[PDB]
Design a binder for this molecule. Structure first.
Ligand SMILES: *[B@]([O])(O[C][C][C][O])[C]([C][C][C][C][N+])[N]C(=O)[C]([N]C(=O)[C]([C])[N]C(=O)OC([C])([C])[C])[C]([C])[C]
Ligand SMILES: [Ca+2]
Length: 223
């Protein structure tokens, strides 16, 4: 997260770290056995690390659970990043409490100007790399579809939205992928792509989760 603030340990209890010997992507727990992340985070040998704050120190409250199957959306297109979403099923259910809790799926899409929280362990620097140890947080508004499309002409599908700041300086960045965008207590976005990090007129683009709620529900119910 570039331009953000330290969240405070376990203040974002639905955030997960997907790990394969290092943190590579964020994720959201949406019930005791299922995590939602981004399809471009897919790989095998994924360990879901729940209840984390410093990802480099075991501090208490951590639950490390192997991913039993990852389910990339069938229409995921890796050249457009359209339908960038994947569900990870956990090998055993997590124990839920105040430091590890699931976030709700939206019942409607959020309007332009809704203030949301984006969080993750990715790069904090726009020019160069600085990985944080602890979870970083950013409050950022959803941008109107016109300013999003004026920034990325031709690249925005209806499954995507921009959030952030046109003046630059604050944004998600590399290592934040797969992580949550929560607006009024509902998971509305998944961190996906952008042109670099926190550059002027280039906001982050996020998978629009309200379009996928029946898919999530139906895929979880059949698996
Ligand atoms: B994401 O993948 O983090 C995990 C990467 C390391 O394991 C990251 C989120 C970036 C959000 C920026 N607001 N997403 C990506 O890196 C995706 N690629 C891009 O955003 C790239 C750098 N830019 C891009 O595709 O657009 C142009 C610059 C216009 C070419 C990618 C990995 C899906
Ligand atoms: Ca830790």
């Amino acid at each position: 997260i570039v331009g953000g603030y330290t969240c405070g340990a376990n203040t974002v209890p639905y955030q997960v770290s997907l790990n394969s010997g290092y943190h590579f992507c964020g994720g959201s727990l949406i019930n005791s056995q299922w995590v939602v992340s981004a399809a471009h985070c897919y790989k095998s040998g994924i360990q879901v690390r729940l209840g984390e704050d410093n990802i480099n120190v075991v501090e208490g409250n951590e639950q490390f659970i192997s991913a039993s199957k990852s389910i990339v959306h069938p229409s995921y297109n890796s050249n457009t990043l359209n339908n960038d979403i994947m569900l990870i099923k956990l090998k055993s259910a997590a124990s839920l409490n105040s430091r590890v809790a699931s976030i709700s799926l939206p019942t409607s899409c959020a309007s332009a100007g809704t203030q949301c929280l984006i969080s993750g362990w990715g790069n904090t620097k726009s020019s160069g790399t600085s990985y944080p140890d602890v979870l970083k947080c950013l409050k950022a508004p959803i941008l109107s579809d016109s300013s999003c499309k004026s920034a990325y002409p031709g690249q925005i599908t209806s499954n995507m939205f921009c959030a952030g700041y046109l003046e630059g300086g604050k944004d998600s960045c590399q290592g934040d992928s797969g992580g949550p965008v929560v607006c009024s207590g509902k998971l509305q976005g998944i961190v996906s792509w952008g042109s670099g990090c926190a550059q002027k007129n280039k906001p982050g683009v996020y998978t629009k989760v309200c379009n996928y709620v029946s898919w999530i529900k139906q895929t979880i119910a059949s698996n």
